[PDB]
DNA sequence: CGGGTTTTTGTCTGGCTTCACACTTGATTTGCATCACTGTTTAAGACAGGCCAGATC
Protein backbone atom coordinates (compact mmCIF):
# COMPACT_ATOMS: atom_id res chain seq x y z
CA UNK A 1 0.00 0.00 0.00
CA UNK A 2 1.37 3.40 -1.11
CA UNK A 3 -0.26 6.98 -0.96
CA UNK A 4 -2.33 6.47 -4.33
CA UNK A 5 -2.99 3.22 -3.38
CA UNK A 6 -4.88 4.37 -0.59
CA UNK A 7 -5.73 7.56 -2.50
CA UNK A 8 -7.34 5.79 -5.48
CA UNK A 9 -10.01 4.15 -3.40
CA UNK A 10 -10.56 5.87 -0.04
CA UNK A 11 -11.56 8.94 -2.44
CA UNK A 12 -12.82 6.79 -5.47
CA UNK A 13 -16.84 7.22 -3.98
CA UNK A 14 -16.35 11.03 -3.92
CA UNK A 15 -16.52 10.84 -7.84
CA UNK A 16 -18.22 7.43 -7.59
CA UNK A 17 -21.71 9.13 -6.51
CA UNK A 18 -21.03 11.58 -9.92
CA UNK A 19 -18.95 9.57 -12.01
CA UNK A 20 -20.83 6.20 -13.37
CA UNK A 21 -17.34 4.76 -14.49
CA UNK A 22 -14.77 2.66 -13.13
CA UNK A 23 -12.25 4.78 -14.81
CA UNK A 24 -13.02 8.20 -15.22
CA UNK A 25 -14.07 8.66 -11.24
CA UNK A 26 -10.77 7.80 -10.13
CA UNK A 27 -8.89 9.98 -13.49
CA UNK A 28 -9.83 13.51 -12.13
CA UNK A 29 -8.87 11.96 -8.72
CA UNK A 30 -4.85 11.24 -10.23
CA UNK A 31 -4.67 14.74 -11.41
CA UNK A 32 -5.91 15.74 -8.42
CA UNK A 33 -3.46 13.58 -6.56
CA UNK A 34 -0.66 14.88 -9.14
CA UNK A 35 -1.18 18.90 -8.44
CA UNK A 36 -0.47 18.30 -5.13
C1' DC B 1 -26.28 -51.61 -52.15
C1' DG B 2 -29.36 -47.68 -50.01
C1' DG B 3 -32.47 -47.20 -45.88
C1' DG B 4 -32.78 -47.15 -40.86
C1' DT B 5 -30.92 -47.27 -35.10
C1' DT B 6 -27.27 -45.88 -32.04
C1' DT B 7 -24.25 -42.07 -30.49
C1' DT B 8 -23.82 -37.51 -30.47
C1' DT B 9 -25.03 -32.99 -31.14
C1' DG B 10 -27.94 -28.14 -32.01
C1' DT B 11 -31.42 -26.13 -28.83
C1' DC B 12 -34.79 -23.79 -26.04
C1' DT B 13 -34.94 -18.22 -23.22
C1' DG B 14 -33.85 -17.33 -17.80
C1' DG B 15 -31.52 -16.46 -14.46
C1' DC B 16 -26.61 -17.60 -12.47
C1' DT B 17 -22.25 -17.57 -12.00
C1' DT B 18 -17.03 -16.41 -11.83
C1' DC B 19 -14.28 -13.68 -13.33
C1' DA B 20 -11.69 -11.03 -17.11
C1' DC B 21 -11.57 -6.25 -17.54
C1' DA B 22 -11.89 -1.61 -18.46
C1' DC B 23 -7.78 2.95 -16.46
C1' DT B 24 -4.64 5.25 -14.03
C1' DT B 25 0.62 5.22 -11.52
C1' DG B 26 4.14 4.14 -8.80
C1' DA B 27 6.17 0.17 -6.05
C1' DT B 28 7.59 -4.10 -6.39
C1' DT B 29 9.51 -8.37 -8.82
C1' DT B 30 11.72 -10.97 -12.81
C1' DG B 31 14.84 -11.39 -17.10
C1' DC B 32 18.73 -10.92 -19.21
C1' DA B 33 22.64 -8.82 -19.95
C1' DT B 34 27.17 -7.48 -18.32
C1' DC B 35 31.71 -7.74 -15.20
C1' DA B 36 36.16 -8.80 -12.96
C1' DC B 37 38.68 -12.84 -12.39
C1' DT B 38 40.92 -17.23 -12.97
C1' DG B 39 45.32 -21.40 -16.70
C1' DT B 40 50.95 -18.98 -15.72
C1' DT B 41 54.66 -25.06 -22.57
C1' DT B 42 55.70 -27.08 -25.60
C1' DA B 43 56.20 -32.89 -26.83
C1' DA B 44 57.22 -35.77 -30.67
C1' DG B 45 59.12 -35.50 -35.36
C1' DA B 46 61.43 -33.71 -40.11
C1' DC B 47 65.13 -31.39 -42.26
C1' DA B 48 69.47 -28.92 -42.41
C1' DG B 49 73.99 -27.60 -41.88
C1' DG B 50 78.30 -27.85 -39.33
C1' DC B 51 82.01 -29.95 -36.85
C1' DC B 52 84.69 -33.69 -36.24
C1' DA B 53 86.51 -38.13 -37.00
C1' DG B 54 87.66 -41.88 -39.28
C1' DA B 55 88.27 -43.85 -43.86
C1' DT B 56 90.55 -43.98 -48.51
C1' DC B 57 93.40 -42.92 -52.67
Redesign the pocket.
Known sequence: P???FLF?SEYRPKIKGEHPG??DV??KL?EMW?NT
Open positions: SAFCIGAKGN
